[PDB]
């Protein structure tokens, strides 16, 4: 919480920003090769593990 | 047709006809508050499988 009171900026939590980049990572933006396109495609999904693991640890689906 | 004819009472299929009787049975069991309460408590809960199964079948979270 000091990192909130030291920093004028605070990043919003609850995984709302992870779904936000995964599409904001919208692809062929890595039209470069397709290795970075995987590097982003692999990365877009790693973002969501916290939004997953909670809805996971909560009811329903981590995915649905 | 004959089931409609033999019984001319249309009853709602599934959980509507299901969870309905259960509370009666429980209340029954509870109003009886003997040992047979447990069979009714078993029976009323025995009903809930099919809607659960339907939720099992449909792809949603049943206990919810």
UniProtKB/Swiss-Prot annotation, chain A:
Compartments it resides in: Cytoplasm
Superkingdom to which the source organism belongs: Eukaryota
Binding site for ATP: 14-15
Sites where the protein binds ADP: 14
Subunit structure: Component of the chaperonin-containing T-complex (TRiC), a hexadecamer composed of two identical back-to-back stacked rings enclosing a protein folding chamber. Each ring is made up of eight different subunits: TCP1/CCT1, CCT2, CCT3, CCT4, CCT5, CCT6A/CCT6, CCT7, CCT8. Interacts with PACRG.
Function of the molecule: Component of the chaperonin-containing T-complex (TRiC), a molecular chaperone complex that assists the folding of actin, tubulin and other proteins upon ATP hydrolysis. The TRiC complex mediates the folding of WRAP53/TCAB1, thereby regulating telomere maintenance.
Entry's disease: De novo genetic variants in nearly every subunit of the TRiC complex, including CCT6A, have been found in individuals with a broad spectrum of brain malformations, and clinical phenotypes ranging from mild to severe epilepsy, developmental delay, intellectual disability, ataxia, and other features of cerebral malfunction.
Family membership noted in the UniProt record: Belongs to the TCP-1 chaperonin family.
This protein's name: T-complex protein 1 subunit zeta
Native source organism of the sequence: Homo sapiens (Human)
UniProtKB/Swiss-Prot annotation, chain B:
Domain of life: Eukaryota
Disease: Neurodevelopmental disorder with speech or visual impairment and brain hypomyelination: An autosomal dominant disorder characterized by global developmental delay, impaired intellectual development, poor or absent speech, and brain abnormalities including hypomyelination, cerebellar atrophy, and optic nerve atrophy. Some patients have severe visual impairment, dystonic movements, and seizures.
Location(s) in or outside the cell: Cytoplasm
Subunit structure: Component of the chaperonin-containing T-complex (TRiC), a hexadecamer composed of two identical back-to-back stacked rings enclosing a protein folding chamber. Each ring is made up of eight different subunits: TCP1/CCT1, CCT2, CCT3, CCT4, CCT5, CCT6A/CCT6, CCT7, CCT8. Interacts with PACRG. Interacts with DNAAF4. Interacts with DLEC1.
Function (record text): Component of the chaperonin-containing T-complex (TRiC), a molecular chaperone complex that assists the folding of actin, tubulin and other proteins upon ATP hydrolysis. The TRiC complex mediates the folding of WRAP53/TCAB1, thereby regulating telomere maintenance. As part of the TRiC complex may play a role in the assembly of BBSome, a complex involved in ciliogenesis regulating transports vesicles to the cilia.
Protein known as: T-complex protein 1 subunit gamma
Family membership: Belongs to the TCP-1 chaperonin family.
Signal peptide location: none
Binding residues for ATP: 14
Binding sites annotated in the UniProt record for ADP: 14
Phosphothreonine modified-residue sites: 33, 62
Organism: Homo sapiens (Human)
């Amino acid at each position: 919480v000091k990192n909130a009171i030291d920093d004028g900026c605070v990043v919003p939590g609850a995984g709302a920003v992870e779904v936000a980049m995964a599409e904001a990572l919208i692809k062929h933006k890595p039209s470069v090769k397709g290795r970075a396109q995987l590097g982003v495609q692999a990365f877009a999904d790693a973002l969501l593990i916290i939004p997953k693991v909670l809805a996971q640890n909560s009811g329903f689906d981590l995915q649905e | 047709c004959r089931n409609v004819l033999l019984d001319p009472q249309l009853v709602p299929g599934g959980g509507a006809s299901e969870m309905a009787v259960a509370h009666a049975l429980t209340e029954k069991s509870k109003a009886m508050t003997g040992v047979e309460q447990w069979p009714y408590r078993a029976v009323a809960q025995a009903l809930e499988v099919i809607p659960r199964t339907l939720i099992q079948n449909c792809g949603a979270s049943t206990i919810r």
